[PDB]
C-alpha cells in the first residue's frame, strides 16, 4: 500500500533537520520502531541520493534504510532509528574521551566506512553530526544527502531529479547547486579545498580530523572565519592532540602516528586503507 499513514504510526518529534522534522514512529502491526524523516518536498533530490546510495546496504555502522513516502505536503524517509544521540553531542558532552573509547569508536567508522568505499560511495561529508549512536554504542553513519559514487558528478544528479520532478512550489530562493552539494569546511580535505574532487584520501582525511576531535575535543583545524580555516587547512600542521583538561592521559605514540598519516596535506602521502587497517593503533582488530 502505498499512503504513508496508513503504513506508519509517529510518536514524539526526535530531532531537526534542514527542511526537515525526525520523529519516532512504527510500522502498523509490528514492534519495529523507527525514524522518520518528514521533509519539504524541495529536498527530494538529496532524498533521492540518499535512498539511492544506501537501499541494498544492511551493515552495522550504516543507518539502514526502509520505505520512502510521498503525500500531498511531505516526503517521508523511514529508516533505522539512532537513539544514542550524534557524536557532535557525545564529543560536547563527554569531557575527554579516554583512548580507549576513541579506538572503538575508530573501529566503528572504518568498518562502515571500508563498506562505503568498498561499494563505490564517498561519504564526502564525514563529521560528527552525520554519524549517531544506535544506543548505548555502535556509530552509524546517518545522513547521505551529500554521498555520491566515486567519480560522480553530484551537482547535475541533483539537477537531474530536480528537472524530472517538473517541488519549489511558490519559493522564488534560487540556491545553486554547487551550494546544495556544500559540506562541512572543518573536515575538508586540502585538495578538496583547493578544487580537486572527493576520493577515497579525502574521506580518510576526515576521518583523521574526527580522531582528532573525539580525543582532543576540537577539530584540528577550527575558525569562525572561512577564509582563516582554508588557511589553516592548507598550510598549518595541526597541534598535538591533547585532552581538553590537561589532566587526562596523553595520547599514546601509536595514535599519534596514525593521525600524522592521516592528516597528511598531500594526498599521495596519506594512508590508504591496506595500511590504515594494518596500523598498530587497532592492536590487531582488522587482523
Ligand atoms: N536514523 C535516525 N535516528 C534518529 N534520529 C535521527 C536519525 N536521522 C536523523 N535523526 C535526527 O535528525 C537530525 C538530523 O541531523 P543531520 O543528519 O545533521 O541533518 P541535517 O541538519 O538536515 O543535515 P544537512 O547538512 O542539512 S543534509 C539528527 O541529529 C537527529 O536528531
Redesign the pocket.
Known amino acids: 500500500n502505498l499512503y504513508f499513514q496508513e503504513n506508519f504510526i509517529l510518536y514524539e518529534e ?5 527542511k ?1 522534522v ?1 520523529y519516532k514512529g512504527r510500522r502498523k502491526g509490528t514492534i519495529n520502531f523507527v ?1 522518520i ?1 518528514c521533509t519539504d518536498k524541495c529536498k527530494r533530490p ?1 532524498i533521492t541520493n540518499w535512498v539511492r546510495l544506501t537501499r541494498e546496504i544492511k551493515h552495522k555502522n550504516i ?1 539502514t534504510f526502509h520505505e520512502w513516502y510521498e503525500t500531498s505536503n511531505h516526503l517521508w524517509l523511514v ?5 544514542g544521540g ?1 557524536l557532535k553531542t557525545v564529543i560536547a558532552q563527554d569531557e575527554n574521551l579516554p583512548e580507549d573509547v576513541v579506538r572503538e569508536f575508530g573501529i566503528d567508522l572504518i568498518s562502515g566506512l571500508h563498506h562505503l568505499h568498498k561499494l563505490g560511495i564517498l561519504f564526502c ?1 564525514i563529521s560528527p ?2 554519524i ?1 549512536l544506535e544506543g548505548p554504542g555502535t556509530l552509524k553513519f ?2 547521505f ?2 554521498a555520491k559514487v566515486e567519480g560522480e558528478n553530484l551537482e547535475e544528479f541533483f539537477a537531474l531529479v530536480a528537472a524530472e520532478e517538473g517541488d519549489n512550489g511558490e519559493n522564488v530562493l534560487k540556491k545553486s547547486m554547487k551550494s546544495r552539494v556544500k559540506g562541512s569546511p572543518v573536515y575538508t580535505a586540502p585538495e578538496v579545498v583547493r578544487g580537486a574532487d572527493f576520493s577515497i584520501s579525502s574521506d580518510l582525511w576526515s576521518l583523521g580530523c574526527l580522531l582528532y576531535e573525539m580525543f582532543s575535543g576540537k577539530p584540528p583545524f577550527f575558525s569562525e572565519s572561512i577564509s582563516e580555516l582554508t588557511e589553516k587547512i592548507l598550510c598549518e600542521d595541526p597541534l598535538p592532540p591533547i585532552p581538553k583538561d590537561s589532566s587526562r592521559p596523553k595520547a599514546s605514540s601509536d595514535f599519534i602516528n596514525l593521525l600524522d598519516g592521516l592528516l597528511q596535506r598531500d594526498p599521495q602521502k596519506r594512508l590508504t586503507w591496506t595500511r590504515l587497517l594494518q596500523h598498530s593503533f587497532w592492536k590487531k582488530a582488522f587482523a
Do not use: F, W
Open positions: 526526535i530531532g531537526r533537520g534542514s526537515t525526525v525514524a524523516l538529496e543507518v529508516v533505522e532509528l539512532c537513539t550524534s561529508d553530526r552525520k549517531l546517518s545522513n544527502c551529500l
